[PDB]
Amino acid sequence: CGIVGIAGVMPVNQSIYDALTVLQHRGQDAAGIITIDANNCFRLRKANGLVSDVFEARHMQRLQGNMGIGHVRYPTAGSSSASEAQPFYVNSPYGITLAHNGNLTNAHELRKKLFEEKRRHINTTSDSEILLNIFASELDNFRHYPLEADNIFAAIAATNRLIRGAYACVAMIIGHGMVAFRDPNGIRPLVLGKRDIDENRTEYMVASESVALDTLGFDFLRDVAPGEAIYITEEGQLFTRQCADNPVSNPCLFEYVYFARPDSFIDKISVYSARVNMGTKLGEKIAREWEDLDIDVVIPIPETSCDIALEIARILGKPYRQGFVKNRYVGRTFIMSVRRKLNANRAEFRDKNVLLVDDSIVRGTTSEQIIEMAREAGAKKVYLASAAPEIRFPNVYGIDMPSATELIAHGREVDEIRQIIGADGLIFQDLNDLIDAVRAENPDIQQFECSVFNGVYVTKDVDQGYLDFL
Amino acid sequence: CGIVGIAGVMPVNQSIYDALTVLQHRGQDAAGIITIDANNCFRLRKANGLVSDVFEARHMQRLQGNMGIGHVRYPTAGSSSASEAQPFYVNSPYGITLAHNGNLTNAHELRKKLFEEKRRHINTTSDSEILLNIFASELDNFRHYPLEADNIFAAIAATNRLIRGAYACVAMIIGHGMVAFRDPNGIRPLVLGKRDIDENRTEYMVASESVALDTLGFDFLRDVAPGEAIYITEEGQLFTRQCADNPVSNPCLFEYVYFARPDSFIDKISVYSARVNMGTKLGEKIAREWEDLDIDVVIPIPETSCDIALEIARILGKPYRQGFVKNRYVGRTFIMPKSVRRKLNANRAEFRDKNVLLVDDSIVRGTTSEQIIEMAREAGAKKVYLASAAPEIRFPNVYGIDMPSATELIAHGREVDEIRQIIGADGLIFQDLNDLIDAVRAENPDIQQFECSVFNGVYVTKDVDQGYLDFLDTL
Numbered sequence A: 001c002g003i004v005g006i007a008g009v010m011p012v013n014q015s016i017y018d019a020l021t022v023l024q025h026r027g028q029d030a031a032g033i034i035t036i037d038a039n040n041c042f043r044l045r046k047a048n049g050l051v052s053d054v055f056e057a058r059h060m061q062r063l064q065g066n067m068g069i070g071h072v073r074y075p076t077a078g079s080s081s082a083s084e085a086q087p088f089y090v091n092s093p094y095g096i097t098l099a100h101n102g103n104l105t106n107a108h109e110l111r112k113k114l115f116e117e118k119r120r121h122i123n124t125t126s127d128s129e130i131l132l133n134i135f136a137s138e139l140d141n142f143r144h145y146p147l148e149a150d151n152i153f154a155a156i157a158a159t160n161r162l163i164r165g166a167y168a169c170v171a172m173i174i175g176h177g178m179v180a181f182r183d184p185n186g187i188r189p190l191v192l193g194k195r196d197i198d199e200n201r202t203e204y205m206v207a208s209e210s211v212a213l214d215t216l217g218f219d220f221l222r223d224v225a226p227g228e229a230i231y232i233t234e235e236g237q238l239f240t241r242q243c244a245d246n247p248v249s250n251p252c253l254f255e256y257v258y259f260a261r262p263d264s265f266i267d268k269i270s271v272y273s274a275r276v277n278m279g280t281k282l283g284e285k286i287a288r289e290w291e292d293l294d295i296d297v298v299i300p301i302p303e304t305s306c307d308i309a310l311e312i313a314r315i316l317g318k319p320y321r322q323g324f325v326k327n328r329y330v331g332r333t334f335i336m337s338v339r340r341k342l343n344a345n346r347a348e349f350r351d352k353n354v355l356l357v358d359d360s361i362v363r364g365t366t367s368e369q370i371i372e373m374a375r376e377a378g379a380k381k382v383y384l385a386s387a388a389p390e391i392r393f394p395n396v397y398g399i400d401m402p403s404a405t406e407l408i409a410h411g412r413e414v415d416e417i418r419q420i421i422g423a424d425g426l427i428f429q430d431l432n433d434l435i436d437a438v439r440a441e442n443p444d445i446q447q448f449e450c451s452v453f454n455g456v457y458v459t460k461d462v463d464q465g466y467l468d469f470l
Numbered sequence B: 001c002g003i004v005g006i007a008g009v010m011p012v013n014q015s016i017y018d019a020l021t022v023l024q025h026r027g028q029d030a031a032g033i034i035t036i037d038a039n040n041c042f043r044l045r046k047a048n049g050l051v052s053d054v055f056e057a058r059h060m061q062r063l064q065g066n067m068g069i070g071h072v073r074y075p076t077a078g079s080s081s082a083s084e085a086q087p088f089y090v091n092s093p094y095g096i097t098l099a100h101n102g103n104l105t106n107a108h109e110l111r112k113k114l115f116e117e118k119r120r121h122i123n124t125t126s127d128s129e130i131l132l133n134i135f136a137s138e139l140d141n142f143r144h145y146p147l148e149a150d151n152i153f154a155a156i157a158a159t160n161r162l163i164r165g166a167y168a169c170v171a172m173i174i175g176h177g178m179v180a181f182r183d184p185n186g187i188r189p190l191v192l193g194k195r196d197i198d199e200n201r202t203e204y205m206v207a208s209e210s211v212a213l214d215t216l217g218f219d220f221l222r223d224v225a226p227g228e229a230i231y232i233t234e235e236g237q238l239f240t241r242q243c244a245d246n247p248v249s250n251p252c253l254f255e256y257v258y259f260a261r262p263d264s265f266i267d268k269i270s271v272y273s274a275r276v277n278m279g280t281k282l283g284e285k286i287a288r289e290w291e292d293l294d295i296d297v298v299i300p301i302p303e304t305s306c307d308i309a310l311e312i313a314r315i316l317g318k319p320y321r322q323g324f325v326k327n328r329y330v331g332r333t334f335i336m337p338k339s340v341r342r343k344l345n346a347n348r349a350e351f352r353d354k355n356v357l358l359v360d361d362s363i364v365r366g367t368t369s370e371q372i373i374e375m376a377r378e379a380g381a382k383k384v385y386l387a388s389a390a391p392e393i394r395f396p397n398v399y400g401i402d403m404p405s406a407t408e409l410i411a412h413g414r415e416v417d418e419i420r421q422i423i424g425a426d427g428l429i430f431q432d433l434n435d436l437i438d439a440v441r442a443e444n445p446d447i448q449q450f451e452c453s454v455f456n457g458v459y460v461t462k463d464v465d466q467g468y469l470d471f472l473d474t475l
């Protein structure tokens, strides 16, 4: 999922659509935008589909207002993918809407408490409707009107004591403004930016990625700190206050590996640069543990791995060539597999021992089939290098990973995987290597959230119980 | 535009859609597919839009048959871009449909003759409806049923005598089969492939690009020769026959420069490799003519130039970094009471306090280039140099590449330095036509001459220059 929120001094409908389009890689199952018009009323458009399919002119026309949020949803299986989309809304207290990227690990416990204590009905399976409600109930506690920044921060604080997991949220309160907050372990991404229209007017915005500020011409200010909350009034006044008991930066590693765009700077780290670095280290590993290997060229499996493979070729002093081309358009198969996504440039494989480079291997299907494609194009020996370490555990913080059994690496040794996928050789990046590759870009980040690679969940509240429940 | 045709022994509806999705880069203005059912009747579906948007399940469900053709229309300005899409169809003789990529230079002359001579009404501006009518009238001249291959071939040859220009065409004749033919100068691309099923059951297909064959698992057989024609009967028999008086290979240079996919082999040339070569040459040209220039990195302008710039970096021994990212999804900009940044984003870190050499495939109107350069300056770039993989574009392509009017061409009537100034580049350098020709040629020396009208103003076909002289004979 991806989120954006603008606190402008002029129409934001187009800007949000535009920010959501550069954040579309984070989710295409559904999209939604909601603003607050001059009458302090919410205007909302949300449906399944791409951003470009969801918002038509009639819809934009209706999304009037100078403050608003948007959300693109990654088809989180389980949560219907045909279920109600975000942003979510509640009429009381005040009027609240919230968009969120992440996942609560105590969602069940939360909806039960909400039902018992507050009588708040949760219509969906989305733990975001849950978050919105916890946050709403905390704001229900205040008497005087309007709430003051502290009240709002106290509510976020109270909320953080209750919910557990990963989350980057942006929300809006009728008659008050916009609030954006981030979980205590700083897992899911969120950045703040601003745009001065003139000497006295300044707009603010937050997004899951810096690309969204970039495309709108907002100047990047900084990442929102772990546990921190930001409250921008309808008058453009900004407030920030730490709302978690023990904030620590454990940014998701996978954002760097695959999930995030290369032109984004998450937690001071350039995704591109980190990615090149993963190349350097992986090249070096191949060079250590595979010195006696005979390959004629390095071939990247587009897109992620394109610059990673180039680096690997540099390190190995071997030639880099584009053997695969990713189809820019993919059509559906009607009820009347990787080949529909990729095409092998025959001339680059014919009678060559090749080293293919991929960002990861989740299930192994793609990898096996890509390898078959190489063999069919004339390749003698086909070796596979994964820019990311083995993926053996599930992510429960907002990256939708297949079931533990679906993970080919799950319970299988590299060789057993190499065999199943039919590669002549298979090599993965060392977790420690990937860490250093990314860490090198900002050494103040000591630890990352790497549950998918090592079964260690920073929130320390995961066991087979939650897993099996899923 | 892009075309595909498949004479199969099993439903082709999915296979055509799949071939059109890999040919989508050739036109996204509209699409159309048309097959022949068991009852020897055409089933068609054409609308404006992307392949993915045009063909819904109800439509596919209706496209029954084992033979069909498809088309993806590049928004040809002038031809409405909201006009009737191809493939086109006529009920007589026999029942004919034709999909076409290219351009007729004597279209005006052609609809006049058709009206006058045969009373054939042309309902659109598409010279493709023209081409379908000429071919239809010529086939009309035959008495015995069915026509034999030679009759069809005779028809095509007759047609080639009449029309003038560039064209790759696939067509179908009810009760007969599929035909495909290419112009006498071999300009517009067309290839043939097959997919064997058994002891004699073999399917054939033609497409504007080998990628369509690859993706469908057809074995690449070969390009269709200039002026050649191909006829596959409904039974699976393949006939081929030269139908031009003086066939020559003058393939479009711009297909190699930009238009075609890198994984396609047009006229024995690999587009990728041709492209890389373009970098080599341009690198070397920069090294000769610029030597005293200080740059810190080579940065491509996605997507075409990515590998070209890589080579230019190699030759210049300068580092290559990805300073621009192409947005994968662009949306509508509504009209509430086309920006380059809507298409591209600059990776700030890669420009900050550096002198950059930006490599782009070409400069048409100059707007993009100008704005891309501003983007580089705003990202902290000190000096910004622009390299064009293609020579200066100063003329209009009247053969099938939609180029904006010659007034819009920034290169039209301007010196390199005047363009550099207009685009705000610290330095500007173009590829040499001769170098680019060698660059592509190096891949298949049998090609002695390309179609380069956009760059050299030399119109390979007959009627373009003769008519220049007819013009000056008035003023």
Ligand SMILES: Nc1nc2c(ncn2[C@@H]2O[C@H](COP(=O)(O)O)[C@@H](O)[C@H]2O)c(=O)[nH]1
Pocket: A022, A025, A257, A258, A259, A260, A261, A262, A301, A302, A303, A304, A305, A359, B325, B326, B327, B328, B329
């Ligand atoms: N150039 C470009 N890359 C993108 C865009 N959105 C996502 N990406 C990158 O695309 C990759 C997609 O992975 P793939 O499956 O193509 O290897 C990810 O590494 C992601 O960073 C986009 O809009 N433009």
Ligand SMILES: Nc1nc2c(ncn2[C@@H]2O[C@H](COP(=O)(O)O)[C@@H](O)[C@H]2O)c(=O)[nH]1
Pocket: A325, A326, A327, A328, A329, B022, B025, B257, B258, B259, B260, B261, B262, B301, B302, B303, B304, B305, B361
């Ligand atoms: N990877 C890939 N490249 C494509 C596809 N279709 C066209 N292209 C390339 O996209 C480029 C588009 O040019 P651009 O304006 O993006 O630089 C052309 O060089 C063309 O070869 C496709 O489906 N996949």
Ligand SMILES: Nc1nc2c(ncn2[C@@H]2O[C@H](COP(=O)(O)O)[C@@H](O)[C@H]2O)c(=O)[nH]1
Pocket: A258, A302, A303, A304, A358, A359, A360, A361, A362, A363, A364, A365, A366, A367
């Ligand atoms: N991890 C991941 N990879 C994806 C996704 N969609 C496409 N891919 C591509 O598929 C590869 C994983 O393929 P698998 O081995 O699961 O069949 C990745 O390298 C990536 O480029 C996605 O949603 N998640």
Ligand SMILES: Nc1nc2c(ncn2[C@@H]2O[C@H](COP(=O)(O)O)[C@@H](O)[C@H]2O)c(=O)[nH]1
Pocket: B258, B302, B303, B304, B360, B361, B362, B363, B364, B365, B366, B367, B368, B369
């Ligand atoms: N020649 C050409 N370039 C196009 C087209 N659509 C996008 N482009 C991109 O735009 C550049 C030309 O931009 P112009 O100078 O016309 O503003 C090319 O380098 C190419 O990447 C098109 O239809 N034709």
Ligand SMILES: [Mg+2]
Pocket: A301, A302, A303, A304, A358, A359, A360
């Ligand atoms: Mg991959």
Ligand SMILES: [Mg+2]
Pocket: B301, B302, B303, B304, B360, B361, B362
């Ligand atoms: Mg370009």
